[PDB]
Amino acid sequence: AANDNNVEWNGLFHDQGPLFDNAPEPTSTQSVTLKLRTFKGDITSANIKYWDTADNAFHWVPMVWDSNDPTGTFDYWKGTIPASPSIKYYRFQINDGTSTAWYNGNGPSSTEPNADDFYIIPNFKTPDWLKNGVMYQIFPDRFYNGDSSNDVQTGSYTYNGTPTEKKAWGSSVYADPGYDNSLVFFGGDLAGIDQKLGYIKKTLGANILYLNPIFKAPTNHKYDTQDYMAVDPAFGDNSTLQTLINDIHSTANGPKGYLILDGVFNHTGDSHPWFDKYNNFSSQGAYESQSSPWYNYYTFYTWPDSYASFLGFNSLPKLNYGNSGSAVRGVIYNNSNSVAKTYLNPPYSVDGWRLNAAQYVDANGNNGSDVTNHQIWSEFRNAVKGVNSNAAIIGQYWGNANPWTAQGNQWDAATNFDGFTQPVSEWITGKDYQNNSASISTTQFDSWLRGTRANYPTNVQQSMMNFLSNHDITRFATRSGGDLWKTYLALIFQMTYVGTPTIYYGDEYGMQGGADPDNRRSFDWSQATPSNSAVALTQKLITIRNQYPALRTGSFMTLITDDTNKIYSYGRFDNVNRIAVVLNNDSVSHTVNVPVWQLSMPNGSTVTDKITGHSYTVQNGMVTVAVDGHYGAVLAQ
Ligand SMILES: OC[C@H]1O[C@@H](O[C@H]2[C@H](O)[C@@H](O)[C@@H](OC[C@H]3O[C@@H](O[C@H]4[C@H](O)[C@@H](O)[C@H](O[C@H]5[C@H](O)[C@@H](O)[C@@H](OC[C@H]6O[C@H](O[C@H]7[C@H](O)[C@@H](O)[C@@H](O[C@H]8[C@H](O)[C@@H](O)[C@@H](OC[C@H]9O[C@H](O[C@H]%10[C@H](O)[C@@H](O)[C@@H](O)O[C@@H]%10CO)[C@H](O)[C@@H](O)[C@@H]9O)O[C@@H]8CO)O[C@@H]7CO)[C@H](O)[C@@H](O)[C@@H]6O)O[C@@H]5CO)O[C@@H]4CO)[C@H](O)[C@@H](O)[C@@H]3O)O[C@@H]2CO)[C@H](O)[C@@H](O)[C@@H]1O
Ligand SMILES: OC[C@H]1O[C@H](O[C@H]2[C@H](O)[C@@H](O)[C@H](O[C@H]3[C@H](O)[C@@H](O)[C@H](OC[C@H]4O[C@@H](O[C@H]5[C@H](O)[C@@H](O)[C@H](O)O[C@@H]5CO)[C@H](O)[C@@H](O)[C@@H]4O)O[C@@H]3CO)O[C@@H]2CO)[C@H](O)[C@@H](O)[C@@H]1O
Ligand SMILES: OC[C@H]1O[C@@H](O[C@H]2[C@H](O)[C@@H](O)[C@H](O)O[C@@H]2CO)[C@H](O)[C@@H](O)[C@@H]1O
Ligand SMILES: OC[C@H]1O[C@@H](O)[C@H](O)[C@@H](O)[C@@H]1O
Ligand SMILES: OC[C@H]1O[C@H](O)[C@H](O)[C@@H](O)[C@@H]1O
Numbered sequence: 001a002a003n004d005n006n007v008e009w010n011g012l013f014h015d016q017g018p019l020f021d022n023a024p025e026p027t028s029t030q031s032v033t034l035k036l037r038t039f040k041g042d043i044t045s046a047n048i049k050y051w052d053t054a055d056n057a058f059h060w061v062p063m064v065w066d067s068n069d070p071t072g073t074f075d076y077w078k079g080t081i082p083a084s085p086s087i088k089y090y091r092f093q094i095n096d097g098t099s100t101a102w103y104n105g106n107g108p109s110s111t112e113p114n115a116d117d118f119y120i121i122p123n124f125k126t127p128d129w130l131k132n133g134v135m136y137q138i139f140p141d142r143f144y145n146g147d148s149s150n151d152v153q154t155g156s157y158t159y160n161g162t163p164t165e166k167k168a169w170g171s172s173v174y175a176d177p178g179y180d181n182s183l184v185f186f187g188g189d190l191a192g193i194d195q196k197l198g199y200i201k202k203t204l205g206a207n208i209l210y211l212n213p214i215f216k217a218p219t220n221h222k223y224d225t226q227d228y229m230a231v232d233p234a235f236g237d238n239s240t241l242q243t244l245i246n247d248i249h250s251t252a253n254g255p256k257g258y259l260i261l262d263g264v265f266n267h268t269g270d271s272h273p274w275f276d277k278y279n280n281f282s283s284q285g286a287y288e289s290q291s292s293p294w295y296n297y298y299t300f301y302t303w304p305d306s307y308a309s310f311l312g313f314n315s316l317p318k319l320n321y322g323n324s325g326s327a328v329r330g331v332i333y334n335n336s337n338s339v340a341k342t343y344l345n346p347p348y349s350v351d352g353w354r355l356n357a358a359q360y361v362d363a364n365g366n367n368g369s370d371v372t373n374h375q376i377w378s379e380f381r382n383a384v385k386g387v388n389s390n391a392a393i394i395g396q397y398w399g400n401a402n403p404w405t406a407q408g409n410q411w412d413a414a415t416n417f418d419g420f421t422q423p424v425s426e427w428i429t430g431k432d433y434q435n436n437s438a439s440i441s442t443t444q445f446d447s448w449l450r451g452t453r454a455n456y457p458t459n460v461q462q463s464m465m466n467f468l469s470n471h472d473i474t475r476f477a478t479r480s481g482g483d484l485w486k487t488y489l490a491l492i493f494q495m496t497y498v499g500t501p502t503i504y505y506g507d508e509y510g511m512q513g514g515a516d517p518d519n520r521r522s523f524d525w526s527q528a529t530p531s532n533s534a535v536a537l538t539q540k541l542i543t544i545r546n547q548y549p550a551l552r553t554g555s556f557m558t559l560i561t562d563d564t565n566k567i568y569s570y571g572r573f574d575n576v577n578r579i580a581v582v583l584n585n586d587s588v589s590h591t592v593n594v595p596v597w598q599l600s601m602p603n604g605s606t607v608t609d610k611i612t613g614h615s616y617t618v619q620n621g622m623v624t625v626a627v628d629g630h631y632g633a634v635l636a637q
């Protein structure tokens with residue numbers, strides 16, 4: 001490069017990784033020093049332009065040359081944004097004579113952007129164990145029956161005039177005639193999970209567990225809560241939970257673990273004593289009497305048959321959060337003996353909550369996604385973080401969760417459907433996560449990922465729940481036609497991308513299943529061993545991620561987007577590590593010349609494909625590696 005009235009986008013780069021930001025999660029008193037990369041001697045001037053919420057105006061901070069990278073290929077321009085309590089957003093204006101280019105969260109641009117600027121949210125912190133961990137999701141009843149004595153039997157009890165049905169382990173999940181899909185139980189419980197911690201924390205290596213509902217409820221999924229204060233008898237009791245939490249936190253059976261619980265706070269089941277539609281309690285619920293001490297916990301349009309609920313389901317009456325200081329906000333999160341704080345406090349001390357249907361939480365029966373909804377979650381945050389500043393908060397949202405995270409006063413992250421699940425699904429399987437035809441090329445994939453990451457602050461990005469699938473969508477293995485290689489590719493990408501790798505029990509070995517409830521089959525433990533290639537790779541990958549901080553909290557730079565050969569290469573890097581990931585989304589093999597010079601990997605230095613053990617030597621900024629179709633290489637140094 002040179003001073004030639006031309007700013008070369010290729011050399012330009014910046015994100016909030018260690019090399020470019022010395023304060024990614026600053027306090028009110030820490031200033032943020034930014035570094036921008038450009039080809040050596042490529043520009044003439046560069047400036048940081050930031051909008052400060054303090055005075056609603058833009059501010060200018062001319063940058064100065066700071067240094068060259070070890071390979072003398074790039075320049076690092078420096079500039080500092082002053083320390084203060086206010087949220088700020090910035091972008092860079094890069095000049096080279098008569099040529100100007102802009103750069104922000106969405107990369108280089110010819111015209112000045114007005115959205116996707118980088119974020120600086122003082123005092124906003126997301127739990128680092130979440131950024132650096134690997135999560136494992138479990139749908140309780142279908143993981144492992146560790147205690148058959150608490151098993152729900154056929155006919156044990158009935159719900160809304162329908163007996164429960166028990167299935168032999170491994171059988172189909174669909175209810176037989178006379179029964180209901182939501183009342184089919186396989187016997188999965190807490191003792192079961194406790195007995196299989198070794199497989200989770202050692203065989204795989206995951207250090208975080210997220211469980212679907214485990215509180216008293218009549219269904220098998222349990223989102224129709226009957227009592228948040230008691231573990232459903234079928235899964236055990238509260239002391240069984242205490243034991244499990246102790247074994248999860250234990251460092252004597254593997255790495256230190258963390259437990260995240262599903263919080264269904266937008267509604268309750270219709271059989272919860274506060275509502276008591278079927279009169280299962282001597283107390284009087286809202287449905288039973290307009291005098292009920294809990295009458296105002298709900299919204300009735302025409303008492304008692306017509307009332308607000310979750311998406312029209314009468315079994316899920318919607319809670320009325322009213323205004324600040326309301327009884328409802330008290331039992332859910334404000335009171336020390338509320339659902340949220342009870343489990344966050346001893347003798348439970350869980351590590352976080354997954355906010356179910358979080359966007360709908362509101363007052364008076366409205367559907368949220370408004371001021372009230374956001375006011376509630378920001379109070380929810382103070383409450384949780386007041387009890388444990390390291391307790392994670394991850395909300396369920398299928399689109400852009402920027403409105404619930406970009407101000408650092410609500411959730412730490414969100415279920416990454418839009419930023420991970422969908423793009424990965426369409427790129428590798430040619431299907432969206434509902435299994436309908438939807439394909440995207442590599443260039444598109446890379447563009448989809450960049451735009452979605454730009455929707456969130458860096459610490460949020462690094463805390464997003466990235467799963468290939470879950471209890472509400474179809475199995476990745478099913479969307480791929482059983483082609484286990486597509487699972488390999490998915491895993492390698494998932495374990496090396498930005499965000500919390502999240503495995504939905506079964507995906508690690510390639511489990512199938514279509515739309516609910518078929519996406520909640522019982523875990524086949526004969527497949528749960530390294531003899532299964534998917535499992536072995538999963539474990540291998542998890543070890544690799546835990547080995548390099550760069551894969552968890554490092555920068556991310558796109559390296560190759562080849563739609564012809566279907567090759568995707570990106571680099572994860574920081575002050576100490578440079579890692580080039582090369583993915584082959586094609587069905588045949590391809591030899592790729594990886595431009596590792598982009599990550600400043602010195603010539604003559606060696607790299608190692610952590611996935612095969614095979615080592616390579618960097619020569620002329622490149623590294624040639626052969627990669628099978630639907631597979632990948634993780635060149636690290
Ligand atoms: O062998 C296979 C090979 O061969 C071929 O395959 C063939 C196959 O052989 C054929 O048989 C054939 O099968 C097709 C499919 O048939 C299915 O059966 C049909 C049913 O018979 C029929 O009744 C049904 O019709 C309606 C139904 O009547 C309606 O009532 C309605 O029901 C919806 C839903 O209700 C209940 O859901 C529960 C949940 O289970 C429970 O967990 C909880 O939900 C909570 C969430 O879990 C939690 O995360 C949170 O979520 C909040 C979000 O909610 C909303 O998101 C929705 C989203 O909108 C949906 O798209 C989807 O993703 O679900 C999510 C989650 O709900 C909201 O939008 C978001 O914003 C929120 O964030 O909170 C909630 C609440 O707390 O509670 C709910 C409610 O109580 C039931 O339990 C559940 O089962 C049910 O689905 O809708 C259905 C229709 O949608 O229709 C089905 C299908 O037509 C079988 O069941 C299927 O398994 C089968 O796939 O054809 C196939 C061909 O494909 C093939 O050729 C080969 O390829 C195969 O390999
Ligand atoms: O901060 C630690 C830093 O210290 C040392 O760098 C000093 C340097 O010794 C000073 O000369 C420098 O002062 C000015 C300089 O007078 C001015 O001309 C220059 O203009 C910007 C141009 O900078 C160019 O970068 C480097 C180039 O990459 C090097 O190979 C070459 O030897 O030096 C130049 C800078 O002179 C850039 O490529 C051009 O496009 C720019 O037009 O700006 C500097 C600084 O404002 O101050 C430096 C303090 O940082 C060490 O040499 C350095 O390694 C340490 O990182
Ligand atoms: O979070 C909403 C919105 O915020 C955007 O940041 C700044 C923007 O940089 C500034 O130019 C404008 O005046 O104010 C907004 C904040 O209100 C961010 O760039 C967007 O992506 C984001 O959607
Ligand atoms: O068509 C399916 C094919 O996908 C490719 O990615 C794999 O390398 C092959 O082994 C497999 O047979
Ligand atoms: O369907 C394609 C689009 O899907 C979603 O809206 C993504 O957020 C967007 O980035 C992508 O372009």
Ligand SMILES: [Ca+2]
Nearest residue numbers: 002004006042
């Ligand atoms: Ca130039």
Ligand SMILES: [Ca+2]
Nearest residue numbers: 147151187189
């Ligand atoms: Ca059991």
Ligand SMILES: [Ca+2]
Nearest residue numbers: 279281282283
């Ligand atoms: Ca009653």
